[PDB]
Amino acid sequence: GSLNEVENTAQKFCVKLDVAAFKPEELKVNLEGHVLTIEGHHEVKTEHGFSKRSFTRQFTLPKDVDLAHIHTVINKEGQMTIDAPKTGSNTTVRALPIHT
Amino acid sequence: GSLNEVENTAQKFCVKLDVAAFKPEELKVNLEGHVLTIEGHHEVKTEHGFSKRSFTRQFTLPKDVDLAHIHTVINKEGQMTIDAPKTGSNTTVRALPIHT
């Protein structure tokens, strides 16, 4: 889970991880509040010993990330991208319904 | 800890691992009987969150291996090589002393 890039603009948040050493089923992505946690665990046995790999990478997302629309995808080259739009990106004038 | 070349002749035994994701100080090589264990642990903190990496690679050396002369090196490119001669590799006739 080598952290390739951090991305933080007005319109979206995005993080990219190197997860090529782990298969999709060996990976977990969890969110609690603003805290995002990615983990990989690989564990093979043999009759000549064994192999084991692991990583945990955790970060706190910006206050204004729209956690409701977080999307995580792993591409064909084993790179994970986790992205979401910002809450206050919509800069036009939005009328709010007044409830009576 | 990817394990590149395993080599095993009557001359020498050799293993080569990809160890570049870790600092030399974060690496352990242990021998227990004929069982060779290579471990890496990296654990970093930040105020963005944290990062943590690990691997454990284990294998059983042949009975043939001269365990007294096992040698471990990491090069500048982050490749570890572990090598040792075999027990019966020097094949010229050796006279043994007889005590009485």
Residue-range domain boundaries for chain A:
1-100
Element at B55 (helix H, strand E): strand B49-60
Q: What share of chain A is helix, strand, coil (3-state, %, to 5)?
A: 5, 55, 40
Q: Phi/psi of residue B97, each to 5°? A: -70, 140
Asked if the C-beta of A50 comes within 8 angstroms of chain B's C-beta atoms, the answer is: yes
Whole-angstrom CA distances from A47 to A42, A50, A53, A54 are: 17, 8, 18, 21
Whole-angstrom CA distances from B15 to A96, B8, B60, B90 are: 67, 9, 12, 21
**Contact call for residues A24 and A35 (beta carbons, < 8 A):** no
Buried residues in A7-43 as b, exposed as e (16+ CB within 10 A) = eeeeeebebbbbbebbeeeebeeeeeeeebebbbebe
For chain B, how many residues are written?
A: 100
Task: Give the list of residues 6+ apart from residue A98 with CB closer than 8 angstroms, or none.
Answer: none
Tokens of A83: 């992205």
Contacts with B21 from chain A: Cβ below 8 Å: 2
User: How far apart, in whole angstroms, are the C-alpha atoms of residue B51 and residue B36?
Assistant: 27
Question: How many Å lie between the alpha carbon of A98 and the closest alpha carbon of chain B?
Answer: 39
Contacts with A56 from chain B: Cβ below 8 Å: 50-52
User: How far apart, in whole angstroms, are the C-alpha atoms of residue B64 and residue A96?
Assistant: 80
The per-type count for chain A, helices as H runs and strands as E runs, is 0, 7
Contacts with B35 from chain A: Cβ below 8 Å: 49
The sheet carrying A12-18 orders its strands as A2-8, A12-18, A79-85, A71-74
Enter the resolution in angstroms. Answer: 2.1
User: How far apart, in whole angstroms, are the C-alpha atoms of residue A16 and residue A74?
Assistant: 9
**Contact call for residues A65 and A88 (beta carbons, < 8 A):** no
Interface contact flag, B50 A58, Cβ < 8 Å: yes
Q: Could you tell me which of A62, A29, A17, A42 has the C-alpha nearest to residue B1?
A: A42
CATH for B1-100, options being 1.20.950.20, 2.60.40.790, 2.70.170.10, 3.20.20.80:
2.60.40.790
